[PDB]
Design an enzyme around this catalytic site. Sequence first.
Site, PDB file in Angstrom:
ATOM      1  N   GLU A 116      -8.981  91.782 -31.793  1.00  0.00           N
ATOM      2  CA  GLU A 116     -10.003  92.447 -32.595  1.00  0.00           C
ATOM      3  C   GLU A 116     -11.258  91.594 -32.719  1.00  0.00           C
ATOM      4  OE1 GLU A 116      -9.837  93.810 -36.722  1.00  0.00           O
ATOM      5  OE2 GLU A 116      -8.354  95.292 -36.078  1.00  0.00           O
ATOM      6  N   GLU A 137      -5.147  92.248 -45.456  1.00  0.00           N
ATOM      7  CA  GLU A 137      -5.421  93.672 -45.305  1.00  0.00           C
ATOM      8  C   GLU A 137      -4.672  94.249 -44.112  1.00  0.00           C
ATOM      9  OE1 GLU A 137      -9.481  94.471 -43.795  1.00  0.00           O
ATOM     10  OE2 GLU A 137      -9.280  96.423 -44.779  1.00  0.00           O
ATOM     11  N   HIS A 138      -4.621  93.503 -43.007  1.00  0.00           N
ATOM     12  CA  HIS A 138      -3.893  93.960 -41.828  1.00  0.00           C
ATOM     13  C   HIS A 138      -2.407  94.139 -42.127  1.00  0.00           C
ATOM     14  CE1 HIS A 138      -6.013  94.155 -37.836  1.00  0.00           C
ATOM     15  NE2 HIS A 138      -7.017  93.854 -38.638  1.00  0.00           N
TER      16      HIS A 138
END
Lengths: 54, 440
Positions: B136, B59-60
């Site tokens: 993150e 997704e990143h």
Amino acid sequence: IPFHPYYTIKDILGALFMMLILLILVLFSPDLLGDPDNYTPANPLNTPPHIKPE
Amino acid sequence: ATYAQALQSVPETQVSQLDNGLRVASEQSSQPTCTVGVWIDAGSRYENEKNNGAGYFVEHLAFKGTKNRPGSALEKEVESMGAHLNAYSTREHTAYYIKALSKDLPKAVELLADIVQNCSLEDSQIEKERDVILQELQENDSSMRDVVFDYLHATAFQGTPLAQSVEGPSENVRKLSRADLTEYVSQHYKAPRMVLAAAGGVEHRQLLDLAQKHFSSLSGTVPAFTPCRFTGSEIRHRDDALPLAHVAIAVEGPGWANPDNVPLQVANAIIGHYDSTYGGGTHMSSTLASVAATRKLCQSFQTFNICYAETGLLGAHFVCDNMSIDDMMFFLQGQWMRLCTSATESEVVRGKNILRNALVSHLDGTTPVCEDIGRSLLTYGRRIPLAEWESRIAEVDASVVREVCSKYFYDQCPAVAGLGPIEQLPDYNRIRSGMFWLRF
């Protein structure tokens, strides 16, 4: 740890074991530790063979 | 305009299915803005111990670069036409959706078709994204609510892929070779496990044409998850320096199927939610909320109905100081057993009204409508109309709520997750004993 959830039933088991021993004594050997000489009227004219406490 | 007429006046969401298996769905009402999104059935539930976190990494890297559009050029096409690109990957679902204008729909699909099918997965992008993911993960470590929820998932689904966090362990993130990402994309981004949802002003015929023209090359026409188990336990992270104590206690609830969701969602609505910055406070109908506001017993509390396919977590998560955890546990458990033993009709009516408002308020705006379409197509196999929801709410009464709460709450081993100064959290034996009422 909180006392109620654990140290109630453990003490229950301990008290039950103590009752096991105590009713064993009462119901099978009642006059075990007690001296038989107690089962005799207290006569102050005769000293017992041996005077001993519990 | 008597609600029911409005409920039947909601435009329906037509559903079509390409040969590849992509399920295309649209709902046109009036708007000149649209939200078009691809929903994948991939997530942390499918990754094994080594692939944990691969979905997050994919997704990143999805938006950074593609094949047809090299790198930042993709962002240009999104920014030049005013579209807003977003993606979210929960434990069992993934989604990439863009909000754009109705005119830009033919382009809107194309960019999406570029993102999902043919990404770039450039090695240097992987190298920088690895550090990005590590930082993150640190930020999420600072996120006490998210940490508590992850702890709850770990301690409830112990020994199952469901317990795995979405981001994955930090050790995994380091290795995460490009081959693993390519394999995960290959065996988790297949056409049958895709829903192309589009809300707003999109015509279903136009959507079908664009989807056929831009998604036909995808794989046309096997690990498909396994029933996880509930392991009633608790994880306590005693960190006394933390200001508040986040606690979350949940029980095995229903799934996406098992219509028991409708009554339970009512019962949770009876408990409600409340934090420090609220309105009436002591005057709130919820007994738990009223007591907490009266005694300042909380800084927050919420009722969650996290439901996966085979199972789900149904419970409550509260934030309070270190000197009010035990009283909170008592009051929350007592409310649960009050619902289980005697629900009353008035409380059920209030819960029904609250739940009725929930769905209609949530299904407002292009993005929530598109998200609902995608999630309903993936989970339920269909987009449940609001009229059917209204009927299901209507069928719920006091007896049904009592029965379902007794089935799911009464005398059940819960899963607890505390974090912070949680030393006053009652021992698990006390918590479980609170889940049965001697009087009843």
